[PDB]
Design a protein around this ligand. Structure first.
Ligand SMILES: *[C@@H]1O[C@H](CO)[C@@H](O)[C@H](O)[C@H]1NC(C)=O
Ligand SMILES: *[C@@H]1O[C@H](CO)[C@@H](O)[C@H](O)[C@H]1NC(C)=O
Ligand SMILES: [Ca+2]
Lengths: 111, 108, 422, 107
């Protein structure tokens, strides 16, 4: 079966060591001299499309009123010729039709 | 720190973005604990999209509160890791606010 | 709803229900939109709103509301003085609270239609609401409102003769000044008196920040009346563009006395230049674009000349000379005649720049100077607030870009408006 | 005038706007229409309005003291609003939030 083989392909990369190590090294205070092995970088290069973008909507209730807002997620991956890997994200919030100041753009959170 | 006694001067005037400009910075452990969740979930979503999954169960779980707090914190001071491993920057504007960050891992 | 739109040669306006009390929780807005080259004159005839006010108010905008400059917020029982505009759009906004109302307002609107015509200090064209000062003396016999040049009455004096005390007048619309005329004042009741010997001019577009007139590197001190008997007038070597004007004395022979006159012009009274609407808001927010921005979340409203709190900056303040540009699409083919350029508030300004245009996309013509040697370069501002106007041969276009080439060491930063015609 | 009457014996439920008119009196937009109210305990206006503060949409709070550019605002016990400061006790603020209540919706 072709689709079976495509599922096998998809699940083969899932558990990759980079996809575990990244969120740790993104959270530690320093940990800059992280080593990653060349073969792991190679198999990372095999699995990521250089672009993705998504919109998702959500609703917030300000007491009696309701307000609808669009989150945009856009993300990129790359592999340098020196086998370095790079991943980046940009995440934005906006009113579902543009507005000057709204609960989604300015929650004024108490902290 | 904020220019507190220049912004706070009067009861009946505040420069816009005042509250987000001088609300207190997050405890640093909390900051890392939120960043770890966000990097994890967005990397999962990217791999799954790279293979054409819809992946809605993952996208459901990004907490808008926590990202908004990080946007504020990286606006007060955009932060950088330990050839520097990491970068994060906030941005804030009337119609929108945003977060941008990157993680890099090195062959050497 | 109540948000009636008007364009007709003569008419009337009022809050819903007149002379009856206006409803609660209104948020009405009204627009007067003039034909080209036609003045708007607006005169109020009743004003009584219950109360800088906090509950109910009338705003007036020199443009679309929340886009054009605010003319004023008006409230209580002082009838807003008659106002005249050439910018072509004048909008009113009426806010009411949930709970209290009074007789409201009614007004009437009309239309009609060198550079040394008096603005109208003597002729009441500056109403008593437009004049103010730092303080009065205790006696109330030298108040600001009497500063009419040929008023056979005492001049102004503040509580102390000193160099910080000031007189201020608000010319509600952008207006161009050519000369300042002065008289001293003997007291009519007691034949001793006061007169100014020298004084300084402070000018602003916005009133929150200022520029003090200079001629050469030194600040100017003007020379003034020898005694209170006769008029003196002093003429500016090139016209200033201003909204607020403030006179500060510097040396008084025996007390401070000011009677004053303001000579000038409208910018609309060059041959055919009208502002196409960066200031008034008629260039919508989608029509302004730039090569780069100081952050990803740019807001194009920063470009406007007097309605923007802070100006544009490129992504890097020290960009490559002539690499960055700012563009407007005028939305229709138009004659362009000139532009007005201003600094941005870092506090920085553009010093030399060039202009380029096309009737269509993917094309760029250069507005070369008449001589064959090189493309025309225009001298810009010398200060972050005071605008400067530059004029060139008739150029039909629809896309216009401005390219900086020299800037204040704090980087490129700018605000802009374009003078067009048909 | 803002009141000539009192229309109430206890604070009406689920109301949605307020304005104080005398110093001694406060009146409310409520589902049934407006009510004018007074507590004899002259401090209680603050408690009453605080107990109603959940309803007030961000624009209604911005119409008051509107120079405060949508930033949170505070109640003195005598009823006058001022701009709140970032240090102020979180109870006595309107327009602040403890969290953004949110629900993803499918596309
Ligand atoms: C979002 O985060 C806040 C604090 O960070 C927490 O109290 C809340 O339960 C979280 N909600 C979700 C859905 O994760
Ligand atoms: C409009 O009003 C002006 C006011 O001076 C008057 O001169 C003019 O005749 C009026 N025109 C009409 C058509 O009423
Ligand atoms: Ca009212």
């Amino acid at each position: 079966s072709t689709w079976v083989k495509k599922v096998i392909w998809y699940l083969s990369g899932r558990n990759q060591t980079i996809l575990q190590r990244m969120p740790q090294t993104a959270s530690k205070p320093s940990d800059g001299n992280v080593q990653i092995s060349v073969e792991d970088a190679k198999i990372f290069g095999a699995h990521m499309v250089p672009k993705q973008t998504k919109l998702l909507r959500f609703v917030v209730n300000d007491g009696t009123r309701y307000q609808m807002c669009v989150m945009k997620l856009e993300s990129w991956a790359h592999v340098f010729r020196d086998y370095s890997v790079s991943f980046q994200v940009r995440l934005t919030f906006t009113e579902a039709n543009n507005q000057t100041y709204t609960f989604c753009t300015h929650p004024n959170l108490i902290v | 720190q904020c220019q507190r006694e220049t912004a706070e001067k009067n009861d009946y005037y505040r420069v816009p973005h005042y509250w987000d400009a001088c609300s207190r910075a997050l405890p640093d452990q909390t900051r890392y604990k939120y960043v770890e969740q966000l990097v994890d979930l967005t990397l999962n979503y990217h791999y799954d999209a790279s293979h054409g999954l819809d992946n809605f169960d993952v996208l459901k779980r990004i907490n808008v509160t926590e990202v908004s707090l990080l946007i504020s914190d990286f606006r007060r001071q955009n932060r950088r890791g330990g050839r520097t491993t990491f970068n994060a920057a906030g941005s804030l504007a009337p119609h929108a606010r945003s977060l941008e960050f990157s993680v890099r891992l090195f062959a050497n | 709803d109540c948000s009636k739109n008007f364009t007709s040669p003569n008419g009337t306006i009022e809050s819903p229900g007149f002379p009856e009390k206006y409803p609660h929780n209104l948020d009405c807005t009204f627009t007067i939109l003039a034909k080209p080259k036609m003045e708007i004159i607006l005169q109020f005839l009743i004003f009584d709103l219950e109360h800088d006010c906090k509950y109910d108010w009338l705003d007036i905008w020199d443009g679309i509301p929340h886009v054009g400059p605010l003319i004023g917020k008006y409230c209580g029982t002082k009838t807003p003085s008659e106002l005249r505009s050439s910018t072509g759009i004048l909008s009113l906004t009426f806010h009411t609270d949930m709970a209290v109302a009074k007789d409201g307002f009614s007004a009437r609107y009309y239309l009609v239609h060198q550079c040394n015509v008096p603005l109208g200090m003597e002729s009441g064209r500056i109403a008593n609401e437009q004049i103010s000062a730092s303080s009065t003396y205790s006696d109330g016999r030298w108040t600001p409102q009497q500063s009419r040049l040929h008023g056979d009455d005492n001049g102004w004096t503040p509580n102390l003769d000193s160099n910080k005390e000031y007189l201020q007048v608000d010319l509600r619309f952008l207006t161009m000044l050519t000369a300042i005329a002065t008289q001293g004042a003997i007291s009519r009741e007691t034949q001793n008196g006061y007169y100014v010997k020298s004084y300084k001019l402070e000018v602003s577009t916005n009133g929150e920040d200022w520029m003090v007139y200079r001629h050469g590197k030194n600040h100017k001190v003007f020379q003034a009346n020898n005694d209170a008997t006769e008029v003196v007038l002093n003429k500016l070597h090139a016209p200033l563009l201003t909204r607020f004007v403030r006179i500060r004395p510097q040396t008084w022979h025996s007390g401070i006395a000011l009677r004053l006159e303001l000579f000038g012009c409208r910018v609309t009274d060059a041959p055919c230049s009208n502002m196409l609407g960066m200031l008034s808001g008629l260039i919508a927010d989608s029509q302004i674009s730039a090569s780069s921005t100081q952050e990803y979340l740019w807001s194009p409203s920063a470009a406007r000349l007097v309605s923007s709190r802070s100006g544009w900056f490129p992504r890097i303040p020290q960009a490559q000379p002539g690499e960055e540009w700012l563009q407007v699409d005028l939305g229709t083919p138009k004659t362009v005649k000139g532009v007005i350029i201003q600094g941005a508030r870092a506090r920085a300004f553009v010093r030399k720049f060039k202009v380029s245009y096309s009737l269509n996309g993917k094309d760029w013509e250069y507005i070369q100077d008449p001589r064959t040697q090189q493309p025309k370069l225009f001298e810009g501002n010398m200060h972050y607030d005071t605008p400067d106007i530059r004029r060139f041969d008739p150029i039909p276009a629809q896309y216009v870009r401005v390219y900086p080439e020299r800037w204040s060491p704090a980087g490129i930063g700018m605000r802009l408006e374009v003078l067009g015609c048909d | 005038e803002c009141c000539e009457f009192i229309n109430v014996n206890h604070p009406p439920e689920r109301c949605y706007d307020f304005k104080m008119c005398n110093r001694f009196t406060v009146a409310l937009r409520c589902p049934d229409g407006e009510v004018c109210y007074s507590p004899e305990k002259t401090a209680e206006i603050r408690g009453i309005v605080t107990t109603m503060t959940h309803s007030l949409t961000r624009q209604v709070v911005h119409n008051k003291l509107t120079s405060c550019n949508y930033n949170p605002l505070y109640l003195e016990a005598d009823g006058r609003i001022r701009c709140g400061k970032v240090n102020d006790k979180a109870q006595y603020l309107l327009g602040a939030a403890g969290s953004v209540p949110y629900r993803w919706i499918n596309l």
